[PDB]
Design a binder for this molecule. Structure first.
Ligand SMILES: Cc1cc2c(cc1C)N(C[C@H](O)[C@H](O)[C@H](O)COP(=O)(O)O)c1[nH]c(=O)[nH]c(=O)c1N2
Ligand SMILES: Cc1cc2c(cc1C)N(C[C@H](O)[C@H](O)[C@H](O)COP(=O)(O)O)c1[nH]c(=O)[nH]c(=O)c1N2
Ligand SMILES: NC(=O)C1=CN(Cc2ccccc2)CCC1
Ligand SMILES: NC(=O)C1=CN(Cc2ccccc2)CCC1
Ligand SMILES: [Ca+2]
Lengths: 359, 359
């Protein structure tokens, strides 16, 4: 089974091609993770996945999506992750983390508490920042303040400090969150970036925040550990041909800047889109990026069906298959997949106290 | 769905009829549980089961099955269980524990390390105790030391001490392990008990160790928390009609002695048996015990198929369905069962950070 072939990138070897993508839990308090996360992550790692990327973790307080989001903006926050790293490693999985800034989509309620921007009179809210003072719209109507040059420098340094802290907590894999309409994505998109300074108004200028942040992180992130990013390569906004071409060119510049792997996603930059959700629908898009930018890739959205994951690998569309919601449903999904694909000794995807009895 | 009806027994209410039965993990060191257990139990509790009975936990060091078995024979051992108890409760499940003494089946290898009695050369082994100096045979050839009256008094007191410790650790449900050929089962069975004193040679005498231990525990276990036991009611040894009659009579005596619920199992007292393993095969046996002894029951062995579990409840064969190995495979099995049975808002079997996204 292709799904259960190991993968080596820089000095890291994953025991199979199953990645658990970052999935926000909205259970942290003041950015500090806790027993929710400890058990959540440890149990999924014991489930058999080769790589577990911890949820979007804010580089600064205002870069949380919600009051429940994890953060890594202090040494105390980083220390909270050490036992998560240790539990993921002890299970034989590789610990990664996605570092993030929610930009104009920040200061929102948890998804089961409205999923919408926090109102001005709710004291839990905060002012958001973005390239330009333009709201997302729909359920996120709050207008962000347009970043100053000093804001840009500060946020870049927060990404650097977050990467340093992740490194020192023991993570072996980092992912910069430049997707899903949050701050990085919103610098790249002409929908959200109307700046006329060095950070807007041309392809080079829109790319600048992302490339400068990558370069700054590259200085502190060890060269022998995968340096990755998530990036929305189209929006399904009627501009897909031009947007995909620019996105692939940016991916080439990411490669030139030392990026080891790209997690290929959708922009979600604006609500006025027509995204064709369906099983493995990203597969052909990820393949195009992989081939044209000559970069390893992962993608997601529907690969909880083991045969879809296997097919995508065999077709050389992906190097790793990210499986999210199926692992919320079943933390041992990798074992389920091993069985479904007829892997020999499938139960030994799990640790012995389970594997012995499930043989 | 009958499976998702709450259940009340004494002061304890379970949110559904799914019990996770005790399942040895063989991961403790000198009886002390650790991060293996913490994550294992917390993750299953979050999976939705209403009751989680912690694995056979030895009342004394020589009462472990293996060098990896959990113990509760000191206050330090009991303190180690507190975070397990609390994590189970935090998840909305009820924490229980099975307290145990492996008798002549003690001093064995872990199941994936031979599953057999520890060899004489091997320095991990220990002397076993039993009602009579008779070996189980087959892969468990070690001859145990026959217990004196002073030994019997000591072991009963160890069970009492264990129950007090379990109480103070915060368990809300206790199960005395009088099944599966360990010490309690072996006092009841004429195969293993050849004593000629007050503890063997008649039905009353063979029952005595079990009734005295129950009565002793009842003195320290809170009256408002379920007091339960697991008991093998037949062996499939060609003596089933007589054995089942005696077992059901002892169940009546357990009820008269304050037992709140009986977990009905098989004896496993000797290897010379022919057990007809199959889906839900214990259902009719448990039903007969429930009906004839007029006591609530649970049973196990095959109910990982949600429809089998539901059917057993609707037939009034069981009050709780114990589902073991399916929870090793999938710690969120209770959610899987809710979906399979078409429960409304089935995903809210799980905590919000999962449920929201799975509906
Ligand atoms: C609960 C939850 C939370 C998040 C997500 C999703 C879900 C379900 N996803 C998107 C996720 O990584 C993945 O791309 C999608 O879930 C699609 O893959 P599946 O179809 O679920 O396997 C996500 N994406 C990301 O880049 N960072 C994150 O922190 C989050 N958080
Ligand atoms: C890993 C493991 C460990 C144990 C068990 C089984 C397994 C699989 N079982 C028996 C268990 O409680 C249950 O009766 C059986 O697993 C049958 O139910 P299932 O078919 O697995 O749902 C068990 N029984 C018991 O009374 N105390 C225990 O500690 C153990 N330990
Ligand atoms: N931190 C992120 O990148 C998030 C991505 N989301 C997109 C999504 C859309 C549909 C289904 C799941 C996720 C929402 C949750 C947080
Ligand atoms: N502590 C106990 O009561 C145990 C029960 N077992 C019986 C069993 C037989 C077949 C399959 C699973 C469990 C073996 C493991 C430990
Ligand atoms: Ca504002």
């Amino acid at each position: 089974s292709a799904l259960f072939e190991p993968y080596t990138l820089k000095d890291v070897t994953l025991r199979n091609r199953i990645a658990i993508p970052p999935m926000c839990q909205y259970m942290a308090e003041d950015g500090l993770i806790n027993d929710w996360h400890q058990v959540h992550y440890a149990s999924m790692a014991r489930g058999g996945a080769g790589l577990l990327v911890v949820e979007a973790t804010a580089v600064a307080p205002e870069g949380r999506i919600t009051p429940g989001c994890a953060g890594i903006w202090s040494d105390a926050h980083a220390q909270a992750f050490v036992p998560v790293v240790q539990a993921i490693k002890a299970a034989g999985s590789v610990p990664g983390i996605q570092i993030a800034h929610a930009g104009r989509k920040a200061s929102a309620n948890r998804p089961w508490e409205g999923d919408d921007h926090i109102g001005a009179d709710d004291a839990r809210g905060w002012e958001t920042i973005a390239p330009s003072a333009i709201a997302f719209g729909a359920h996120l109507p709050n207008v962000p303040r347009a970043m100053t040059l000093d804001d840009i420098a500060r946020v870049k340094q927060d990404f650097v400090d977050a990467a340093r802290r992740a490194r020192d907590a023991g993570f072996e894999w980092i992912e910069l969150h430049f997707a899903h309409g949050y701050l990085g994505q919103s610098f790249f998109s002409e929908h959200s970036n109307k700046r006329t300074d060095a950070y807007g108004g041309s392809f080079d200028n829109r790319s600048r925040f992302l490339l400068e942040t990558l370069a700054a992180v590259r200085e502190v992130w060890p060269e022998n550990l995968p340096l990755t990013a998530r990036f929305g390569v189209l929006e399904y906004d009627g501009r897909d041909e031009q947007t995909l071409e620019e996105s692939i060119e940016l991916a080439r510049r990411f490669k030139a800047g030392g990026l080891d792997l790209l997690s290929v996603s959708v922009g979600f930059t604006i609500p006025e889109t027509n995204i064709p959700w369906g099983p493995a629908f990203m597969g052909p898009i990820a393949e195009r990026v992989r081939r044209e930018a000559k970069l390893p890739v992962t993608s997601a959205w529907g690969f909880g069906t083991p045969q879809l994951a296997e097919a995508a690998l065999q077709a050389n569309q992906l190097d790793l298959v990210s499986v999210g919601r199926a692992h919320l449903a079943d933390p041992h999904w990798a074992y389920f997949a091993a069985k479904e694909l007829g892997v020999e000794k499938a139960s030994w995807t799990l640790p012995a106290p389970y594997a012995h009895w499930l043989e």
